[PDB]
Design a protein around this ligand. Structure first.
Ligand SMILES: CC(C)CCC[C@@H](C)[C@H]1CC[C@H]2[C@@H]3CC=C4C[C@@H](O)CC[C@]4(C)[C@H]3CC[C@]12C
Lengths: 105, 106, 28, 104, 37, 34, 106, 28
């Protein structure tokens, strides 16, 4: 049994034809309507384990789909050139300051 | 009930099924056998979202995995605090070195 | 992100300035 | 069809552009070898590309990418700050060297 | 998000210029200091 | 998207280095007078 | 043989080789010139062709592809000008500092 | 608006720190 995952322009939702239980992860917001949940904003890194049963014609069969989003908008792409270039000059600047302070005494 | 684990580092992406930790498990993507498999996990690279981003199921010889990720090479995430403490620790270590040099040099 | 870069350095610098002024006013 | 077999790959939300046709040459020179990848759009890719099949030497087409992430601002709201900061720093350094030379 | 990156890459050149311009004053100070002491 | 974050982090690093360099130059100039 | 030369100045893009785009006969379309304003990325891109009269436009030598975005009064540089700015600033600072140092030694 | 105010604060406070360091050095 598959749990379809619809996707609008800026919304991520979970649909079934029966009750779905949020056991672990992020539920988002509380919604009283049955057989439907709203995960929330697409850029929230939503994660969780969602437990959805079968339909009337597929009774007494459970399906558990692990839904994991990694669409990061607060992630940083690093290149080795810049970080090494700044770390070496920071180290040399700190050494120099120490030298100066010493000389002062 | 045991949740899946996944660690997307750089371009190579790891997916594991810890349901059967004492055997080796095959792998499919949309009921098609699948870049390569491992002893227990999945070692996949050159990731894309348009393709190879769907529903994954592990099976030996009802717990399903569906994921989507914008893989970014040599590129990870950090929140506000993870960069806010770096300046603090830098200031602390430089101050400690300064105090040590000053006090040791009478 | 901009508020982070605003507050992070300026806090330490501001504190420095204050601790410096306090000393100058106390000595006077 | 129409002796323009090279068709760039579109509809990609990632920082990576692709070019394909239905070996490879850069500016008419032997750089490529074989969907051949081109590169990321951030680095502002350029060049001349070629694909061919059963038919003889096909007809080129070029790609211009302008994506900069390097362009800066040039209106009055920023040049004023630049001039102010530069002049203040210059004046501070001049005062410092002036005094310094006073001791010597 | 374009405007923020625009301003940020404007400020980066400013700060690189200021550091590379303070280096020359450090160099002019160190020569006199070495000559004296 | 994912490149502006380095542009923002590097400018903070350069601000840090600017403060360090000004401290260096101030300390050395103050010492020269003694 | 020679690829078309385009050098965007501000919001003005200038290109020359007729001029069509997806064979559909504001947008400045001149008989021997082509310039274009408010170059939005979403609505203004694709393929461009230089083909003469008397021929169906799909026999041009080679195509074009533009995905440029442009802001108001923003100019970019490779590493030619940055070195020029750095060296001219260093020369100015050295000259002024040396002059004010010599004026100091009275 | 925030980045420009941020850099303005940085500069103003830095100048204040320098002048206060000078004044403290003279008085001592
Ligand atoms: C970043 C740097 C170059 C900015 C300028 C700082 C230096 C060059 C200047 C600014 C103010 C100056 C100080 C002003 C007043 C005094 C008190 C006097 O009894 C001894 C010199 C001393 C202590 C000066 C030393 C040099 C000094 C510290």
């Amino acid at each position: 049994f598959k749990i379809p995952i619809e996707e609008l322009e800026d919304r991520v939702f979970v649909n079934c034809n029966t009750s779905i239980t949020w056991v672990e992860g992020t539920v988002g917001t509380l919604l009283s309507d049955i057989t439907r949940l709203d995960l929330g904003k697409r850029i929230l890194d939503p994660r969780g384990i969602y437990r959805c049963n079968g339909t009337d014609i597929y009774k007494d069969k459970e399906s558990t789909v692990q839904v994991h989003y990694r669409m990061c908008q607060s992630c940083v792409e690093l290149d080795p050139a810049t970080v090494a270039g700044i770390i070496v000059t920071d180290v040399i600047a700190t050494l120099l300051l120490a030298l100066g302070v010493f000389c002062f005494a | 009930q045991t949740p899946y684990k996944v660690s997307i580092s750089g371009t190579t992406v790891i997916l594991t099924c810890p349901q059967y930790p004492g055997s080796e498990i095959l792998w499919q993507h949309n009921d098609k056998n699948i870049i390569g498999s491992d002893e227990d996990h999945l070692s996949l690279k050159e990731f894309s979202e348009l393709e190879q981003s769907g529903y994954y199921v592990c099976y030996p010889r009802n717990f399903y995995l569906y994921l989507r990720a914008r893989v970014c090479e040599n590129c990870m995430e950090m929140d506000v605090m993870s960069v806010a403490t770096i300046v603090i620790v830098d200031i602390c270590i430089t101050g400690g070195l300064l105090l040590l040099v000053y006090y040791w040099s009478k | 992100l901009d508020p982070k870069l605003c507050y992070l350095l300026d806090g330490i610098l501001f504190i420095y300035g204050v601790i410096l002024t306090a000393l100058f006013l106390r000595v006077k | 069809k129409g002796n323009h077999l090279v068709k760039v790959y579109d509809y990609q939300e990632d920082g990576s552009v692709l070019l394909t046709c239905d070996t490879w040459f850069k500016d008419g020179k032997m750089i490529g070898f074989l969907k051949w990848n081109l590169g990321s759009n951030a680095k502002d890719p350029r060049g001349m590309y070629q694909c061919k099949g059963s038919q003889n030497k096909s007809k080129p087409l070029q790609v211009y990418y302008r994506m900069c992430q390097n362009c800066i601002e040039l209106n009055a709201a920023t040049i004023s700050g630049f001039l102010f900061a530069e002049i203040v720093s210059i004046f501070v350094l001049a005062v410092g060297v002036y005094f310094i030379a006073g001791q010597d | 998000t374009l405007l923020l990156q625009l301003t940020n890459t404007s400020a980066y050149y400013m700060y690189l210029l200021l550091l590379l311009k303070s280096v020359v004053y450090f160099a002019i100070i160190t020569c006199c200091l070495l000559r004296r002491t | 998207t994912e490149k502006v974050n380095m542009m923002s982090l590097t400018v903070l690093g350069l601000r840090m280095l600017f403060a360090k360099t000004v401290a260096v130059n101030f300390l050395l100039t103050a010492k020269l007078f003694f």
